[PDB]
């Protein structure tokens, strides 16, 4: 008579297909997805400090466009710029715009200390019809538009030493007037010139009279430049006209901060990983949502799915 | 598959085993039954969880990086930025594809291994009291009631108790 | 090599087997012969073709990239361009070296595995009618003509038919 | 009596050596080469659209050097520049030559639409002994050399709006005359100046009188610049002398196109992968022919051979 | 662990074996002894040295590269330089982690394999003169003095010499 | 009676823990460290040619600051710059300092051939109180400060052809005088201008009068520029004032050379791999000492230890 004893293993009615070294399709009892491929669509406001730029670029908030007055002295882990943003102050450009944007984004603060520059011999606080603050003609909050006093503009030669323990970041500019009339009216002489220097650096800028296509009815332009000044070093501004001057400096830090272009809304929720499509969970090691990420994120890969087997081969009955 | 048990000499899995990954079926005087082996089941599961611990929830923080989308044509420096990111992405994509493919081959092999070790362990336990039928089953050449079967599953089977009965049945004419 | 059959207990390969990768040689009353086993041969071949399908003819299109040769000295930006490409090339070169070395270890092991499974399958088939000589050969303890040998190769050998003859020959003095 | 049954495996008389994880030399019955290490030496004309530059650089065909007149409005998947190429028109340079070359290469077309610029007050179509077209004195086909009319050169102020749905690419220049004689003769006044602007951009260029070492007997130079103009945006040229002006614009596309330096001949044959040494087959996953490639190509590696085993270990009899 | 010998059916290692990695312990009429097996020991060691040859002393020369530390804030181009180096470092760090983890799994498995092959080889050698106790030990059913044990270790044991004695002892009542 | 024969394996009393694919902690009989994590702290002087910069930057030795006179015509595999370094000659800057530093570092020689430039009509060898050589007023050894002869400075127009088989590297400059007094005193006229050209290139530089913050009591500056001249090509210097001229050229090679910032001392010892923390052994494949390396070095990884098993699993008795 006797007995029979059989060794065996389980199987399931609903197997899944995985790839192996020797076979692109083998069925296993169970598997798990290694690529994150979806977001809810919202950028979670925690645990990172999000600053929604809304109608403002980082640069506009930096320069102090009036609609960005709400941004004075703010900090961020991540600054979010919106595609609907637009400028509504004096037309400008920034040679190496991308680099200034990057270094501010990365510093992660708009903290601004005012400084009293000795601007004797000129009229301060120039304004315009293109930069409206509280219905009045105004200007960039962080910039100081200098014009003649009593139809005269002497050689400016102004110093500011950095005796602090941090770098100072100075933002300044040059007015390119639209016609010959707008070079003689505010500065009282045919040709401006600006020279911003330190012990280690010098930047010289020649203003350039001529019409540009009008932007918000204005055919002139401002060109923005920057200068970083170290401890023990000194800022020096020689100018003979056309100086758009600083009112002080920005603190430049180092840290974890950055900037991201996205139109995702901000949600009240907690998520370590932000993409431009929204926050994504970070349990999986890979993701195909976006190559642009911030925080503790899965790595971007081209694949849409990668199944890891978590069970034996499925051999149905 | 590399050990030859799962999808080899064991013809198929058992959908009716839901309390374990590996186990035993028997026929004796008292009927036909099934019981899961927990030790070999847990051995496989621990190994798979080990791989999971190395892959799930282990991400790396990045902060300020480079730009990866562009509104203007710029040439040289933009070419380099795009090239760096495209290079990076192909290398990680390669890592991910290889990883899954190697881990999957290994998971399939380790699970077949657990099946094989259980079979081998059981074969040694039975000594001269049984023969291998070639399909994962042993023909046991003695009366083996539910307590005896239980004793083989629990590692307490004393082969000397039944040896005489079994040798007589095995080497018959 | 990890299973111990090829370049282990099987002393060498057979150059005279040209119709398969694995097979059987025999000596009986009717003479000395050879026959390939197609199933184990195809199992090995399918696995190797699987690796080939993942490597051959699977290339990725690239178009405009960066410059990689230069006629002038330029410094910073050229340094970065050269560095990126040199970085990329070392990483792919590493991937290629590792891939081949791992795949080759696995191919050698899977082929030894196929040999081992065939041997084991045959051992179980013979039951008590044969003993393992330790060098891949079975001593069969009964008259086993060409049809009997054929039946072992085709999985149709009925061990009960010869058992009495074999036990008598095996446990002789 | 009984029988003997032996299990066994094949072997071959001609084994090959492969590398493994545990052994740098083990012999297997068969292997396959994973690194492509040869080309036939010819760039196949299919399936990619090849444009042989012959005696012309991409930039020369762009600017319209007369020997490149055959290239007007052509397209390409891959533009091939030859080492024997040379310029035979007015000596020039391009600040950021590499970038202009790259963006044109990548756009993959020389499609040019002419535009009627209002150039009243100056003489158009200036020519030279250094740019011979059909035995006559000529110029760059896409450029318009502007000089005085009746020994007078008024302030040019010319506009061209982009009301099209694509970007326009404008190429223009500045003449740097070789002596004081060649600044007063064609422009009638001591100092030129050029300012090309848009709503988002401005480029200003000061001509610079002085001798350069002569190139094809000419000691003056042209400096080439470019401006991209978006839909809704407008081009503006202020000039007071020395303007080498556009006759229109180039269509700038995005796509799969590029450029490659090679001296390989073009063959009538079909191959997906091009290198500078010639086309190569793309069955293998790796190649050590060239780091520079175009199309569906094996990846470049430093190794010259990588053998994948395709058979068991070889254990001879 | 994948073969089931080391940390499986062999309950533990032997700290008193210092002249080899694998070996034999015996009890017979003449006492209780130990001897290392050199061939299986050297087989494991050769394989591990093979991996070492591929990792130790194989470095690649680099010379002028890019800058990797910076005293000034610069923006775009510095971002790209830092990004390239950070990318590179994560990829190599990944390669190193994977390499060690895979090699370590393979070393553990190859060493268990060597143990298993020795056990199997010995089992075949003994033929019908011994039975597997299930814990790495064979019960040998005949008088087997030190020269006989020596002969099993040296591959010279003639099983026919003792077969009659052994079958009589094995199939007793 | 019979016998017992047991198969078995060794074990050790002192196991070590390694990581595997399936287990982060498994004990093996033996292991080896794959990450090099220490240096002795010294940069070995062999087998690479080390040049200790000591008080001098590469650029100072290039320009020929007097404290760097010891460096004339030296070669190096690796130039080591020290944090204590400082300049003690005429204050200067280099637009694209990083690139000049890099191309010299990489050329790996300061070999300088003098050339006789025809500087008739001006006074050569200008000197200053800020550049002291052997207690006397001096200048940069490789530069030639040109001033007026008999209160006159004519139009310089000086040529030098490269008839050699190698590139020539020319270093030159522009004086930016600190006040109007220091523009009229040495050059005799209100505005300098420099134009250095070749058949393939032109660089033009406008001097810029104005005060900078004083560096070692000096408020003026020199700005350094470079020009590479190929075989068959010719250098041309037009100048109307302010030219800091070359005395000749540097040989620019290609090879294995570079530069490294470190304060490690130089030792009499032999080591293929140099980091800024000191030389490290290169037996291991990886290292976490420094991302900056030179020579035959282990690859930098983030991990501090990676144990490779070199023995079986340890299963104690
Ligand atoms: C198919 O394979 C996958 C992977 O092996 C497997 O999914 C895993 O299952 C376990 C258990 O179902 C999951 O573990 C849970 O994780 C979450 C956190 O994300 C916890 O909330 C859970 O906690 C429970 O248990 C705790 C007590 O021990 C309590 O604290 C708590 O109240 C919960 O009850 C739990 O730890 C694991 O997340 C998944 N993993 C993945 C990647 O999905 C699945 O079960 C397998 N399917 C089958 C049919 O076997
Ligand atoms: C160089 O050429 C450019 C382009 O032609 C030129 O810029 C243009 O100048 C004109 C004239 O000043 C601008 O015209 C104005 O535009 C605004 C906004 O669109 C209109 O509101 C104005 O309307 C008033 O003027 C009309 C004309 O008499 C009246 O009929 C009307 O009732 C209004 O009072 C007016 O049309 C034009 O906007 C710019 N264009 C651009 C693209 O900038 C520039 O002036 C030239 N440069 C020089 C120095 O001459
Ligand atoms: C050593 O190993 C290699 C790799 O395993 C092996 O080479 C391979 O052999 C096969 C068959 O000889 C090749 O397959 C051919 O591929 C080409 C396309 O490139 C086709 O033209 C061939 O088609 C034939 O068969 C078809 C019918 O099924 C017909 O349509 C046609 O008319 C042809 O007759 C065929 O598919 C394969 O390309 C190679 N691979 C490589 C990488 O070389 C080789 O055979 C092994 N050597 C030994 C001695 O076993
Ligand atoms: C600044 O210095 C440079 C370099 O010296 C100088 O450029 C040179 O100018 C001379 C004189 O104009 C050029 O000489 C000509 O070259 C051509 C081509 O090689 C020759 O065919 C010419 O020959 C004619 O003139 C001869 C002299 O009278 C006659 O004897 C002969 O029969 C011919 O009629 C002539 O030699 C020379 O090519 C350039 N060199 C370079 C490298 O450019 C430049 O003129 C100076 N600048 C100023 C503003 O003075
Ligand atoms: C634990 O594992 C490691 C790695 O397997 C192991 O360390 C290795 O041991 C060997 C021998 O002890 C070392 O080999 C030496 O290498 C140095 C060069 O760096 C040589 O000087 C040595 O030469 C000796 O022998 C030669 C004759 O054959 C003579 O020429 C000479 O005079 C020397 O006596 C020798 O080749 C090897 O370097 C290490 N490797 C590492 C990475 O440490 C260790 O032994 C293992 N531990 C145990 C307890 O098994
Ligand atoms: C633009 O503004 C800047 C900043 O104010 C200015 O630069 C400064 O010029 C002054 C005056 O020339 C410099 O003062 C000298 O500094 C040195 C070194 O520290 C001192 O040794 C000097 O001392 C002498 O002069 C004193 C004043 O009469 C005497 O009392 C004394 O006994 C000495 O004889 C003197 O103080 C100052 O160093 C610079 N500062 C900087 C930061 O460069 C510049 O001059 C202005 N530009 C123009 C064109 O006016
Ligand atoms: C996340 O956003 C990205 C970027 O917009 C999406 O990728 C784009 O998808 C569109 C299709 O709608 C394609 O036409 C573009 O080529 C993609 N753009 C880029 C820049 O790659 C992506 O679809 C989104 N992913 C998820 C999961 O929502
Ligand atoms: C393809 O062309 C490349 C580039 O010319 C060749 O690589 C050069 O080979 C020469 C030897 O003739 C070396 O001196 C150079 O160092 C190499 N140049 C570069 C830029 O790497 C290569 O030999 C060719 N390959 C084939 C397969 O024909
Ligand atoms: C080698 O030098 C590097 C660079 O100075 C050291 O890394 C720095 O370590 C300090 C701690 O003292 C940290 O504050 C810095 O973040 C590190 N700097 C950088 C640039 O990474 C490192 O400690 C040294 N390594 C050894 C083994 O001596
Ligand atoms: C199979 O079915 C169950 C029950 O609906 C489900 O929860 C489980 O995830 C399925 N498993 C797989 C691997 O699809
Ligand atoms: C942003 O600008 C839009 C359009 O001009 C306006 O409707 C909206 O109120 C503004 N939003 C904020 C938050 O200032
Ligand atoms: C410039 O503006 C600020 C803020 O509106 C004001 O307090 C300051 O007094 C103004 N400056 C002068 C010189 O009036
Ligand atoms: C075997 O184990 C089960 C529980 O795991 C127990 O209920 C049973 O009584 C045991 N039988 C024997 C014979 O050991
Ligand atoms: C075994 O198979 C072969 C063909 O594969 C056949 O010719 C032969 O007759 C078969 N013999 C038996 C006994 O099954
Ligand atoms: C061995 O020889 C044959 C016949 O010449 C040849 O076709 C085959 O490719 C060779 N195989 C190897 C692996 O070299
Ligand atoms: C290219 O130029 C060479 C040398 O001047 C000439 O011989 C050849 O005919 C030209 N080829 C073409 C295709 O224009
Ligand atoms: C300039 O050249 C073109 C083509 O040769 C010609 O048709 C056009 O009329 C010329 N322009 C003028 C103003 O004559
Ligand atoms: C077995 O080998 C050892 C040495 O390895 C030798 O001393 C011994 O005499 C041998 N014994 C037999 C029986 O072969
Ligand atoms: C164990 O102990 C010995 C003797 O002190 C030592 O040399 C050896 O390296 C140790 N092994 C490990 C793996 O720690
Ligand atoms: C370097 O400068 C320091 C401080 O001025 C001085 O003490 C030292 O002697 C100088 N060393 C050399 C090698 O010139
Ligand atoms: C310039 O200096 C050098 C070296 O001190 C000297 O030999 C040369 O004659 C000087 N030049 C003139 C024109 O005096």
Numbering used by the authors:
A (entry chain A), D (entry chain A), F (entry chain A): 9 to 325
B (entry chain B), C (entry chain B), E (entry chain B): 1 to 173
From the paper:
The majority of human antibodies against influenza virus that are elicited by natural infection or vaccination target the globular head domain of the hemagglutinin (HA) glycoprotein. Subsequently, we focused on A/Brisbane/10/2007 (Bris07), a WHO-recommended H3N2 vaccine strain from 2008 to 2010 and a commonly employed model strain for experimental studies. Here, we structurally characterize an egg-adaptive substitution, namely L194P, in H3N2 virus hemagglutinin. Our results reveal that the L194P substitution substantially increases the flexibility of an epitope region that is commonly targeted by antibodies.
To understand the structural implications of this mutation, we determined crystal structures of Bris07 HA with both Leu (L194) and Pro (P194) at residue 194 to 1.70 Å and 2.30 Å, respectively. Except for a slight displacement (less than 1.0 Å) of the 190-helix and the 130-loop, the backbone conformations of Bris07 P194 and L194 are almost identical. Thus, the effect of the L194P substitution on antigenicity is not simply due to alteration of the overall structural conformation or of the amino-acid side-chain substitution per se. This difference could be visualized by comparing the electron density in the 2Fo-Fc maps, which was much weaker for the 190 helix of Bris07 P194 compared to that of Bris07 L194. The mobility of the 190-helix in Bris07 P194 was also captured in a molecular dynamics simulation. The major peak reaffirms that L194P increases the conformational dynamics of the 190-helix, whereas the minor peaks suggest that the increase in conformational dynamics propagates to some extent to the neighboring regions. The elevated mobility as assessed by conformational dynamics in the 190-helix of Bris07 P194 apo form appears to be diminished in the receptor-bound forms, as suggested by normalized B-value analysis.
